[PDB]
Amino acid sequence: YQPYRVVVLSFELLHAPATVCGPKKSTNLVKNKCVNFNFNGLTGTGVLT
Amino acid sequence: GKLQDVVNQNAQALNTLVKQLSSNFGAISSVLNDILSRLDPPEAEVQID
Amino acid sequence: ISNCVADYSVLYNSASFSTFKCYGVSPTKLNDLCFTNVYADSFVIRGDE
Amino acid sequence: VRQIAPGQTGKIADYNYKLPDDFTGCVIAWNSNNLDSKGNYNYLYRL
């Protein structure tokens, strides 16, 4: 019966540009090589050409 | 006509196979890289399965 | 909430809370994503509610 | 006590005691307010 404070956060996850991002910051690009990329929060393994 | 119908049936079957890669079958997404960039390993297994 | 660089580890590593419960994501991955629009809601209810 | 589960986050899981996801075995906990608390400043955790 004691009071509790409640916060509810809600968000979308992939839309029109990012506009709120996390605490990490960029590295420099490496091309023609297998990497694990991350652009605005969309990951994947590939080769950037 | 009998030779063209073989090419038409072999192309409907390969187009259905590519189009089924955009179904989620009950998971939270159809993209495998968005399940892996949003869930920790125990929760992710139930969605990739 | 918009146009930020929000840290999230400053919240859940602080042990102020008895209920942290994320739904579409996992709390480990929140420092890697970008959220497009964030809403926050606040109220006070009883214990069991 | 909720952070001694296979896959959590906070202080005890991130810095003190971490369980593996492939974990088999039981977790037991019980309340000891009298015998341990005289504040007693010998029990420590890593910040």
Side-chain angles (χ1 to χ4, degrees), chain A residues 2-41:
Chain A
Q2 305 170 317
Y4 278 73
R5 283 175 190 208
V6 169
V7 195
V8 168
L9 297 147
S10 88
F11 31 70
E12 275 302 284
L13 259 166
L14 172 53
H15 281 264
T19 320
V20 161
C21 281
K24 298 185 142 168
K25 190 50 70 181
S26 312
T27 312
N28 47 358
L29 278 180
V30 284
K31 293 181 204 162
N32 305 71
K33 187 184 174 318
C34 300
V35 299
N36 301 313
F37 44 84
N38 199 316
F39 293 78
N40 283 8

Side-chain angles (χ1 to χ4, degrees), chain D residues 5-19:
Chain D
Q8 291 299 327
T9 183
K11 289 301 275 209
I12 320 290
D14 279 335
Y15 299 141
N16 303 123
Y17 190 65
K18 163 78 77 180
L19 277 187

Side-chain angles (χ1 to χ4, degrees), chain B residues 36-40 43, chain C residues 24-26 28-29 33:
Chain B
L36 287 171
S37 85
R38 277 167 49 171
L39 286 174
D40 282 351
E43 19 267 5
Chain C
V25 294
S26 290
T28 313
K29 296 276 190 179
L33 298 171

Side-chain angles (χ1 to χ4, degrees), chain C residues 12 15 17-21, chain D residues 1-10:
Chain C
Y12 55 88
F17 324 109
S18 71
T19 295
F20 211 95
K21 190 175 189 290
Chain D
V1 183
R2 50 165 282 260
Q3 298 192 28
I4 314 298
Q8 291 299 327
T9 183

Side-chain angles (χ1 to χ4, degrees), chain C residues 1-24:
Chain C
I1 285 181
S2 294
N3 289 319
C4 323
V5 181
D7 184 276
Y8 286 77
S9 177
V10 71
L11 294 184
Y12 55 88
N13 291 118
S14 299
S16 301
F17 324 109
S18 71
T19 295
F20 211 95
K21 190 175 189 290
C22 298
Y23 280 98

